[PDB]
Design a protein around this ligand. Structure first.
Ligand SMILES: NCc1cccc(-n2cccc2)c1
Ligand SMILES: [Ca+2]
Length: 223
């Protein structure tokens, strides 16, 4: 997250870190057994880390649970990033508490202008590279479809939305992918892509989670 703030330990209790020897992507806990992330984050051998603040130090609220399976969306295209969503099942259920909690799925799609909280452990600089160890947060609005399309001609599908600031300065970034965009207490987005970070006229692009609720629920119901 570029241009954000330190969230505070365990203030974003549905945020998980995906670890394969190291943090590589975020995710969102949606019930005790399942995490939502980005399909472009798929790999084998994922360990889900819950209850994290400083991802380099054991601080006492973590739960580390290996994935028993990953399910990438049936229509994910890694060239266009259309349908950039996957589900990850935990080998055992998380212990839910005030610091490890699931985020409800939306009932309807959020509108442009709605305020959202975007979070992750990604790079904090537009130019060059500095990772944070503690979780970062950014409040940002959803942008109109028309401005998202004008920002990225030929590349915004009906499964994507933009959020952030056309002026630049404040955006998600590398290492935040797969993490949450929460608006009015529901998961509306997944950190997906953009062109650099925090550049003028290049806001972040997010998977539109409200399009996937019926796939999510029916996949969980049979896996
Ligand atoms: N600024 C949005 C965004 C989201 C997620 C990743 C990236 N990114 C990856 C490499 C460089 C930037 C950007
Ligand atoms: Ca930790």
């Amino acid at each position: 997250i570029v241009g954000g703030y330190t969230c505070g330990a365990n203030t974003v209790p549905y945020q998980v870190s995906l670890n394969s020897g190291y943090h590589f992507c975020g995710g969102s806990l949606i019930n005790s057994q399942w995490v939502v992330s980005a399909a472009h984050c798929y790999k084998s051998g994922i360990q889900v880390r819950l209850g994290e603040d400083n991802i380099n130090v054991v601080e006492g609220n973590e739960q580390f649970i290996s994935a028993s399976k990953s399910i990438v969306h049936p229509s994910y295209n890694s060239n266009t990033l259309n349908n950039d969503i996957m589900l990850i099942k935990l080998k055992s259920a998380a212990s839910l508490n005030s610091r490890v909690a699931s985020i409800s799925l939306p009932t309807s799609c959020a509108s442009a202008g709605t305020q959202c909280l975007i979070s992750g452990w990604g790079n904090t600089k537009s130019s060059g590279t500095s990772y944070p160890d503690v979780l970062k947060c950014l409040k940002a609005p959803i942008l109109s479809d028309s401005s998202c399309k004008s920002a990225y001609p030929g590349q915004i599908t009906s499964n994507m939305f933009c959020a952030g600031y056309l002026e630049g300065g404040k955006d998600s970034c590398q290492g935040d992918s797969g993490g949450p965009v929460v608006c009015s207490g529901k998961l509306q987005g997944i950190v997906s892509w953009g062109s650099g970070c925090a550049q003028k006229n290049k806001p972040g692009v997010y998977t539109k989670v409200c399009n996937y609720v019926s796939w999510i629920k029916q996949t969980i119901a049979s896996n």
